[PDB]
Amino acid sequence: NKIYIENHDLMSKVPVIEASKESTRDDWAALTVVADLDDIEGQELVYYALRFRKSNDGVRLDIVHNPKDTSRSPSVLAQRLKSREDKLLDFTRFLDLETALETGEFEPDVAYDASLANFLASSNMKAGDNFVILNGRVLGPITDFKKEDFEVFLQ
């Protein structure tokens, strides 16, 4: 649990696709993708995670933006994505995601940026790293991994 418990601030601010009400408890699982969405390789991972969630409605997906470069507030992209949180399964096209990360004025959330900086240090992962956490299991860094590999780890 301890990852989930120590980080409630951050995890409360990130984009979340809730598992469906009409899925079962045996289907239910918790996927976190942590990705640098300034880079294609991070975006691509999230895209796959989205596609996976689209097919597997027992999963609760949330997405943590974890940029290597911090000159911009991490919280900007995270808010861009959080604003468009309902829309995320309507994506059909890698471009829909790019678009969603491309636009939206937001005021930096410092408390978010702090939360992130904890989460990283206490979870011994670095800024910029791409990884997934699946029901508590950290997998990464990811330096391939597509929606197959999500599927299998669910089994």
Numbering used by the authors: 673 to 815, 819 to 830
Quote the study that presented this structure, word for word.
The final model of Form 1, refined to a resolution of 3.40 Å, had an Rwork of 23.5% and Rfree of 29.2%. The crystal belonged to space group I23 with six molecules per asymmetric unit. The structures of molecules A–F were highly similar to each other with an RMSD value of 0.11–0.37 Å for superimposed Cα atoms 94–155. Molecule A in the crystal structure, which had the lowest average B value, was used for the comparative analysis and will be primarily described hereafter. As expected from the bioinformatics analysis, the crystal structure displayed a typical Trx-like fold, i.e. a five-stranded β-sheet with a β1–β3–β2–β4–β5 arrangement surrounded by six α-helices. In the crystal structure, a part of β5–α6 loop (residues 816–818) was disordered. The C-terminal α6-containing segment showed a higher crystallographic B-factor (87.7 Å2) than the average value (79.7 Å2). The α6 helix was stabilized mainly through its hydrophobic surface, containing Phe820, Phe825, Phe828 and Leu829, which made contact with the hydrophobic patch, including Leu703 (β2), Leu717, Phe724 (α2), Val804, Leu806 (β4), Leu811 (β5) and Ile814 (β5–α6 loop) (right). The Trx3 domain possesses an extensive hydrophobic patch, which is covered by the flexible C-terminal helix and can participate in interactions with hydrophobic molecules. Moreover, we provided snapshots of the 3D structure of the third Trx-like domain, in which a putative substrate-binding hydrophobic patch is intramolecularly masked or involved in an intermolecular interaction, offering a key breakthrough toward understanding of the functional mechanisms of this ER folding-sensor enzyme.
UGGT acts as the gatekeeper in this system because this enzyme is capable of sensing the folding states of glycoproteins as potential substrates. UGGT only transfers monoglucose residues to incompletely folded glycoproteins. UGGT is a large enzyme, comprising approximately 1500 amino acid residues, which has been putatively divided into two regions: an N-terminal folding-sensor region, which accounts for approximately 80% of the enzyme and is not homologous with any known structures, and a C-terminal catalytic domain, which accounts for the remaining 20% of the enzyme and belongs to the glycosyltransferase 8 family. On the other hand, the folding-sensor region of UGGT was found to harbour three tandem Trx-like domains: Trx1 (residues 168–379), Trx2 (residues 467–624) and Trx3 (residues 671–831).
